């Protein structure tokens, strides 16, 4: 990948590495949409909490936030908006999962919300022994 306007630091490569990742994500979303368009119709007649989890896999943040806000929930829409991949919330999600796994009995939450809460910790099938995405 080649950039148009040059920057000050030319020793590294931060804009090209981001552009390549964005292009790869856009290609993966376009390739997975043909198999995600059919799964969203069958999930709408069963549980409404799985729609946000199904739409978040196609690189749709605003589309998932609007669906979470227009369905009775309010905390899920505010939690899914911070999916940038930084820290802070990465440890907070793990702390919340560890608190919900014990303390107040077992805390039987929903299956769709657990995946969305564990995906914001930077590891959905690695640093999550309880809510593993395997």
């Amino acid at each position: 990948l080649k950039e148009l306007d040059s920057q000050l630091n030319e020793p590294r490569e931060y804009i090209q590495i981001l552009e390549r990742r964005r292009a790869f994500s856009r290609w993966l979303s376009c390739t997975a949409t043909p198999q995600i368009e059919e799964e969203v119709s069958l999930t709408q007649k069963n549980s409404p909490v799985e729609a946000v989890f199904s739409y978040l896999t196609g690189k749709r943040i605003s589309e998932a936030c609007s669906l979470a806000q227009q369905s009775g929930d309010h905390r899920l829409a505010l939690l899914l908006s911070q999916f940038v991949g930084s820290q802070s919330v990465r440890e907070l999600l793990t702390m919340q999962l560890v608190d919900w796994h014990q303390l107040q009995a077992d805390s039987f939450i929903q299956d769709e919300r657990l995946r969305i809460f564990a995906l914001l910790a930077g590891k959905p099938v690695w640093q999550l022994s309880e809510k593993k995405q395997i």
């Binding site: 806000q69 908006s81 303390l103 009995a105």
Partner: protein
């Protein structure tokens, strides 16, 4: 911290709260240690003595119907009244210590979530040791308001939750004094002003407001008229 430096109304209103909390503290005196409870060892000791509670959490009483004992209900009411008195006097640390010693972990966690999130690496002004507070202040306030509005709970606990969220009460307001009512009104006005400032500064999220809150804040003349109608 920047609001309290810049805004004389918020700062002077807090000095009136601290003053009214000091009066209530002077009235409590040294008597905090002489509270005889019927339970000596465990939460709801008499209800436990009489197995019928499938869950040890506090949400079981709101989910199911009647499943607690009279002694357990009396102990819970006394604990809620003590927590409300401590919050009115201005001893949050003492109330948290008492809750932790009694065994009210959920109550302690709900009371410790009153402070907002303050990171020492991001905020260079008030750089401390570790990051404390919760980033979902609006969500916590909405949850506290919902818990205070919901029934099947203690009258003192609901009033304390409403006062912590930024609203009024009705069961504990019959025996409240003029100074206590003025302090509650000042606290509600300060909470409304803080919420308005956070909404105008684009600090909270657009979906963090689960329930509708009272955006209108009272002024000095409104507080004076309220105090008059309360205790002419």
């Amino acid at each position: 911290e920047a609001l309290f430096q810049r805004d004389s109304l918020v700062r002077q209103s807090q000095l009136v709260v601290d003053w009214l909390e000091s009066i209530a503290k002077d009235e409590i005196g040294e008597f905090s240690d002489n509270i005889e409870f019927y339970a000596k060892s465990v939460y709801w000791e008499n209800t436990l003595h009489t197995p019928l509670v499938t869950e040890l959490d506090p949400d079981a009483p709101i989910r199911q119907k009647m499943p607690l004992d009279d002694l357990d209900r009396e102990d819970e009411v006394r604990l809620l009244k003590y927590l409300f008195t401590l919050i009115r006097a201005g001893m949050t640390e003492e109330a948290q210590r008492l809750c932790k010693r009694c065994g009210q972990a959920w109550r302690a966690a709900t009371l410790e979530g009153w402070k907002l999130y303050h990171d020492p690496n991001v905020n260079g002004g008030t750089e401390l040791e570790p990051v404390e507070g919760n980033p979902y202040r609006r969500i916590w306030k909405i949850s506290c308001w919902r818990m205070a509005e919901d029934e099947l709970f203690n009258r003192y606990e609901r009033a304390i939750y409403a006062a912590l969220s930024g609203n009024l009460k009705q069961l504990l307001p019959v025996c409240d004094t003029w100074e206590d009512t003025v302090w509650a009104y000042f606290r509600v006005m300060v909470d409304s002003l803080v919420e308005q400032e956070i909404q105008t500064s684009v600090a909270t999220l657009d979906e963090t407001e689960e329930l509708p809150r009272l955006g209108a804040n009272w002024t000095l003349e409104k507080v004076f008229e309220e105090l008059q109608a309360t205790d002419l």
